[PDB]
Amino acid sequence: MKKNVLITGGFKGIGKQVALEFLKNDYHVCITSRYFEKEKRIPHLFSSYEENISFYQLDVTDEEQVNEIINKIVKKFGRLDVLVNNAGISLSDGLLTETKTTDFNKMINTNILGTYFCMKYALKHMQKVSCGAIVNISSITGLSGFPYSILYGSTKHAVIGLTKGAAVEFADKGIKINAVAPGIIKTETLQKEIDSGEFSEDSISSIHPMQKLGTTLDVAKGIYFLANEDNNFITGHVLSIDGGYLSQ
Amino acid sequence: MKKNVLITGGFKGIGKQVALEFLKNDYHVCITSRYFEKEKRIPHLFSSYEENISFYQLDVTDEEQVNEIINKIVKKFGRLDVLVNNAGISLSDGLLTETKTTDFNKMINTNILGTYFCMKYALKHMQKVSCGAIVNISSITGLSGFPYSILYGSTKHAVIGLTKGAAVEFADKGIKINAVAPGIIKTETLQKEIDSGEFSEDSISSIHPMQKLGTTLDVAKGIYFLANEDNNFITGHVLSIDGGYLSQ
Ligand SMILES: NC(=O)c1ccc[n+]([C@@H]2O[C@H](COP(=O)([O-])OP(=O)(O)OC[C@H]3O[C@@H](n4cnc5c(N)ncnc54)[C@H](OP(=O)(O)O)[C@@H]3O)[C@@H](O)[C@H]2O)c1
Ligand SMILES: NC(=O)c1ccc[n+]([C@@H]2O[C@H](COP(=O)([O-])OP(=O)(O)OC[C@H]3O[C@@H](n4cnc5c(N)ncnc54)[C@H](OP(=O)(O)O)[C@@H]3O)[C@@H](O)[C@H]2O)c1
Numbered sequence A, B: 001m002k003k004n005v006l007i008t009g010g011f012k013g014i015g016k017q018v019a020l021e022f023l024k025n026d027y028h029v030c031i032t033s034r035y036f037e038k039e040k041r042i043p044h045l046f047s048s049y050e051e052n053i054s055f056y057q058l059d060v061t062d063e064e065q066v067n068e069i070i071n072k073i074v075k076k077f078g079r080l081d082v083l084v085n086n087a088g089i090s091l092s093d094g095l096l097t098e099t100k101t102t103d104f105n106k107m108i109n110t111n112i113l114g115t116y117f118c119m120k121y122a123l124k125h126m127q128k129v130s131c132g133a134i135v136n137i138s139s140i141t142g143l144s145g146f147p148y149s150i151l152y153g154s155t156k157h158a159v160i161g162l163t164k165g166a167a168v169e170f171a172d173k174g175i176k177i178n179a180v181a182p183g184i185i186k187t188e189t190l191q192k193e194i195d196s197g198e199f200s201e202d203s204i205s206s207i208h209p210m211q212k213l214g215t216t217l218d219v220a221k222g223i224y225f226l227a228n229e230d231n232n233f234i235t236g237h238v239l240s241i242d243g244g245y246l247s248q
Helices: A013-024 A036-045 A047-052 A063-077 A101-129 A150-173 A188-195 A201-205 A216-227 B013-024 B036-045 B063-077 B101-129 B150-173 B188-196 B201-205 B216-227
Strands: A004-007 A028-033 A053-057 A082-085 A132-137 A175-182 A238-241 B004-007 B028-033 B053-057 B082-085 B132-137 B175-182 B238-241
Touching: A004 A013, A004 A063, A013 A028, A013 A047, A013 A082, A013 A216, A028 A036, A028 A047, A028 A063, A036 A047, A036 A053, A047 A053, A053 A063, A063 A101, A082 A101, A082 A216, A101 A132, A101 A150, A101 A175, A132 A150, A132 A216, A150 A175, A150 A238, A175 A216, A216 A238, B004 B013, B004 B063, B013 B028, B013 B082, B013 B216, B028 B036, B028 B063, B036 B053, B053 B063, B063 B101, B082 B101, B082 B216, B101 B132, B101 B150, B101 B175, B132 B150, B132 B216, B150 B175, B150 B238, B175 B216, B216 B238
Parallel strands: A004 A028, A004 A082, A028 A053, A082 A132, A132 A175, A175 A238, B004 B028, B004 B082, B028 B053, B082 B132, B132 B175, B175 B238
Antiparallel strands: none
16 A cells, blocks of 8 residues: 555665655665665664565675565565665775776676666566656766766766666656765764764865765655655756755 | 745746645745736635735846845745745747847846846845755756757756856855756646647657656646755755756
8 A cells, every 4th residue: 555665775874764764755665785684673773664664685786686576576565666776885995097996896786787787677567557766876976077986986977877868768658767966975884984083074074065964864855856756757867965066 | 933935926837836835835925926916816826825925016127126025025024935036938939040139138137137136135135044945947948959949048048057156155154046947847828829729739748758748736846845944955956857858
């Protein structure tokens, strides 16, 4: 009876807040981790929402598993209203000439191929019912040049390419496909790097015109807006959630 | 007491639906017309919301009147949470070589100067309280070249310039300033232009990848999202509401 959303992730950072936002809006939420040990955290991370959450172990770089997991979800729930491609990694070295090819391949595998696999199998099902929403997560580095994050940015550019291409291809099938482009977001990972003193909050906050960091809630709200049933006419679009970064 | 929004318009087309959207979300709404006689329509257009609506006669091309009306609103309500620059005109002729300078100046006056005047005086007030949101209405023609709508397109490009410029300028002052870029929207005006027979619906909807026209609700929903209290980190952005038009 509830709309059903799959988030690649859900246990930390942006993904957890995305899960919470859909839960607060009466969705059934499928969340994932590579680690089966995370399933037991559910009643404690999402106190009152436990009954509306389903766990799946999933590595998005494993195409066969992506197909299996999405098939399982469709079989169990008989619907797949929304896919949120949250899973992503950033392996930041130094300048381009010092970067490791193994790092770039890992980012490609997770950020590009993982998003591609999830789209590919989600769309096979969404096509049949001529409805659904996909929201991909890019970055400001997906729309501009960012020193020391060139390779990550390249993958996030590629994500935008998958978003716009798929959008145009599936536009007449009533499926919406959009992306968000967050600026620097204060996740748990960043908060502890600030708390360990070796990273000044104001130092990184200053790259945004708004002179503050983004929150996981800022991102979750944008994703929810693009995904919900009241989105009838927005597709192929990249929503910047960046404190004004891309406008200068 | 209630959040207060000013819309330049409110009696027809996109502007009416924007009023309705803010009303449904518990705002007090100031709506305007150049024509004082429209005020008596309010109990009939907005049956159950009449108590939460205030009428102001306003021509946005008259800078003195813009300053007067915004001052009167702030004096009476003691707040101005949101400004929506809805007022705009399209005077289409033929190719660029056949266009009338008088038509261009009219569009410049309403679409560029009107938006600028309202921003200018709204920001003098919002600056004082370090909060507020402005949503401007541009167009897909503000982000692409559109034969036979070159002059209108030029004014809507200019709107984006005002949007991005002010966003960066006021970002550190807590004020959000964004725009929407709608595709072709089925308003009352368009509905009857299809009814006359000069246009087929399928004919003009075919320019959008989604193969349908946008609605006034589509636009109102996008505007509300950018304007509401839960937008903390989106500024300087142009939200496309165009059935995928700009993604091709
Ligand atoms: N943080 C930022 O400032 C920022 C800015 C712009 C964009 N983004 C993007 O936003 C998304 C979320 O970032 P975040 O900072 O919230 O990340 P995070 O806190 O590091 O969490 C990463 C999430 O992705 C999952 N994941 C990673 N690799 C996976 C794989 N191979 N298969 C399945 N799941 C995998 C993790 O699941 P398990 O570890 O439980 O398996 C976890 O849920 C990413 O795409 C990121 O690039 C982040
Ligand atoms: N319709 C579309 O497909 C479309 C697409 C992209 C963008 N837009 C833009 O969206 C906005 C609304 O369009 P719409 O189609 O809803 O327009 P509409 O139905 O023609 O309504 C025009 C509105 O603008 C007001 N207005 C016009 N000139 C004014 C002036 N000099 N001073 C104050 N108010 C003035 C009118 O008020 P009174 O007549 O009551 O004085 C009315 O409320 C415009 O900026 C338009 O360019 C529309």
